[PDB]
Amino acid sequence: KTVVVTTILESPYVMMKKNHEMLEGNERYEGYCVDLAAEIAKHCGFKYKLTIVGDGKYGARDADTKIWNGMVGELVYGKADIAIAPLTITLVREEVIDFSKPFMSLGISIMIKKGTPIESAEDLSKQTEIAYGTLDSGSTKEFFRRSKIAVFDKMWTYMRSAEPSVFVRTTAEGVARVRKSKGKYAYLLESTMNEYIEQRKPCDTMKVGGNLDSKGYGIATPKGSSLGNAVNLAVLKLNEQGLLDKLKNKWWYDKGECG
Amino acid sequence: ANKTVVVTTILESPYVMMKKNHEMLEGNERYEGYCVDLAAEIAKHCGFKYKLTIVGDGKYGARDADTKIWNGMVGELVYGKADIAIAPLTITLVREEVIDFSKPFMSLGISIMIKKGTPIESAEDLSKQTEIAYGTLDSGSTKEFFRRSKIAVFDKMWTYMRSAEPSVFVRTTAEGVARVRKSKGKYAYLLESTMNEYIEQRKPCDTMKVGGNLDSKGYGIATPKGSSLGNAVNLAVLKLNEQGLLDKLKNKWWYDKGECG
Numbered sequence: 343k344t345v346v347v348t349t350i351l352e353s354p355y356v357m358m359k360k361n362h363e364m365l366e367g368n369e370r371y372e373g374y375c376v377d378l379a380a381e382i383a384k385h386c387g388f389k390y391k392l393t394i395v396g397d398g399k400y401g402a403r404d405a406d407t408k409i410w411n412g413m414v415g416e417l418v419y420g421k422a423d424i425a426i427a428p429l430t431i432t433l434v435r436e437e438v439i440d441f442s443k444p445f446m447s448l449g450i451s452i453m454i455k456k457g458t459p460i461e462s463a464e465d466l467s468k469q470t471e472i473a474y475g476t477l478d479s480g481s482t483k484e485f486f487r488r489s490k491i492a493v494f495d496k497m498w499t500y501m502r503s504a505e506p507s508v509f510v511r512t513t514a515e516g517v518a519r520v521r522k523s524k525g526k527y528a529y530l531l532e533s534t535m536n537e538y539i540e541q542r543k544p545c546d547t548m549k550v551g552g553n554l555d556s557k558g559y560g561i562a563t564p565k566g567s568s569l570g571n572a573v574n575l576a577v578l579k580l581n582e583q584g585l586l587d588k589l590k591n592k593w594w595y596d597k598g599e600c601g
Numbered sequence: 602a603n604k605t606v607v608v609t610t611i612l613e614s615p616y617v618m619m620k621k622n623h624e625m626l627e628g629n630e631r632y633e634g635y636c637v638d639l640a641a642e643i644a645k646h647c648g649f650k651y652k653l654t655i656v657g658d659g660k661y662g663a664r665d666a667d668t669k670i671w672n673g674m675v676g677e678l679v680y681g682k683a684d685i686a687i688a689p690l691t692i693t694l695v696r697e698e699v700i701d702f703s704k705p706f707m708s709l710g711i712s713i714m715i716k717k718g719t720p721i722e723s724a725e726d727l728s729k730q731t732e733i734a735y736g737t738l739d740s741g742s743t744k745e746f747f748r749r750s751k752i753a754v755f756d757k758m759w760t761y762m763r764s765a766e767p768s769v770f771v772r773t774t775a776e777g778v779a780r781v782r783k784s785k786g787k788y789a790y791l792l793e794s795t796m797n798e799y800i801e802q803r804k805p806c807d808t809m810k811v812g813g814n815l816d817s818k819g820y821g822i823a824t825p826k827g828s829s830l831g832n833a834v835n836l837a838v839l840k841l842n843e844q845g846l847l848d849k850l851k852n853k854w855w856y857d858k859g860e861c862g
């Protein structure tokens with residue numbers, strides 16, 4: 343049986359190729375997670391189909407219906423066999439799905455438009471002229487909803503009440519908002535994507551400050567699925583052989599246009 | 602069914618250390634450190650009584666190539682002497698094949714410790730020369746990293762290290778540090794960034810971590826394969842990390858206690 347692999351369009355993990363229109367199936371896509379899947383699949387010995395998660399989300403639970411969306415939902419409700427994406431290992435998710443050991447480390451970070459007088463979360467939290475938000479339906483937004491350390495609680499309180507909404511549907515949307523808001527909008531997102539964007543034309547954004555936390559991405563499977571075991575072992579072997587570090591260099595820095 | 606959980610661990614600063622007055626204290630109270638703090642938390646959130654015990658042979662764990670027997674903290678779990686290990690125990694493939702690991706509670710990488718002023722900036726630097734000697738911990742993941750590496754700079758360093766005389770390998774982290782301090786810059790030490798960074802904050806303040814990490818990995822809390830504890834422990838680590846506890850603990854034992862301004 344072919345493995346249904348759910349993933350999301352997010353750079354530089356999974357992207358459509360320049361010439362995608364003439365390509366078919368898995369060949370249409372390229373990127374870090376695209377290579378990883380091939381590798382995972384090779385060492386685990388399976389054929390698989392890359393499909394793009396329908397609602398374009400990572401996954402969260404509707405507090406009312408208790409229904410999961412995003413890639414989490416596709417796994418939980420049986421639509422997909424495995425998620426290969428920049429999906430953050432968290433407690434509420436681990437309660438309903440399986441994660442492999444982290445294939446990549448990262449932290450919540452701040453993106454600014456160059457020249458923006460912000461150096462920290464502290465800075466953001468003690469001012470009002472510059473708006474800031476996060477990705478909706480992701481681990482980052484949950485972070486602030488659950489974090490009552492002084493600075494963060496203050497920020498969440500501002501964000502959860504802010505108007506018009508500081509929250510965004512995708513990273514691209516968040517990133518475009520920073521770029522067009524003449525420095526009046528900052529964007530909270532994971533260091534991996536932040537660092538990546540900093541190295542792309544128009545080269546007008548930067549990561550300022552350090553990460554707010556430490557965590558990781560895991561390959562996810564439905565609870566107690568037969569693939570979880572081998573997948574997990576594969577990730578370890580891949581990390582140990584330098585392949586992961588190799589892919590990260592290939593997709594981040596070898597592919598960087600801000601010299 | 603009320604069983605005190607036997608916790609195997611290792612004496613490694615600042616993870617687990619003897620209290621100055623341990624001679625007058627009993628049980629768990631004899632000890633202090635990051636992993637001592639962690640152990641108390643994990644047991645509280647998993648609802649169990651536990652006894653801290655120092656690993657008998659003082660090692661992390663490797664499989665003897667001849668006898669095929671596992672030593673160190675890993676062996677303790679494999680052969681049933683202990684119920685759980687809570688230490689700076691690196692998650693690796695060969696270990697994961699024989700025991701269970703939680704999701705990582707701390708991140709790290711192989712790094713270079715030098716005596717200050719030692720003309721070394723990188724691994725490539727070590728490999729390109731011979732005046733300065735360098736070694737790793739025995740029976741650890743770092744050594745195995747090099748013995749297995751297929752990348753040029755690392756195979757070079759390995760083939761040098763494995764044949765070098767006298768041996769550039771040490772029995773304990775402390776032995777490696779002292780050797781750096783006493784070797785006038787003629788010896789450099791390969792170890793994980795977490796320990797490197799700790800030691801750089803201690804008197805006499807004569808060492809430093811140079812370069813970037815060679816790799817990226819994690820410490821995990823280990824249980825015997827199939828043990829019932831694994832699930833809760835794993836869930837506990839994820840919550841403690843999200844509630845910020847792990848971040849606090851690293852502050853407490855590394856930086857709030859720095860002797861080097």
Ligand SMILES: O=C(O)[C@H]1NCCc2c(O)noc21
Pocket residue numbers: 400401428429430477479480481482483513531532
């Ligand atoms: O939800 C997730 O899996 C996280 N990884 C993707 C990027 C992200 C984000 O912007 N907020 O939370 C996350």
Ligand SMILES: O=C(O)[C@H]1NCCc2c(O)noc21
Pocket residue numbers: 661662689690691738740741742743744774791792793
């Ligand atoms: O083996 C291990 O679990 C690693 N963590 C402890 C310190 C260490 C070391 O010096 N080499 O490898 C390791």
Ligand SMILES: [Zn+2]
Pocket residue numbers: 381384
């Ligand atoms: Zn391969």
Ligand SMILES: [Zn+2]
Pocket residue numbers: 619623
């Ligand atoms: Zn003593």
Ligand SMILES: [Zn+2]
Pocket residue numbers: 642645646
């Ligand atoms: Zn607690």
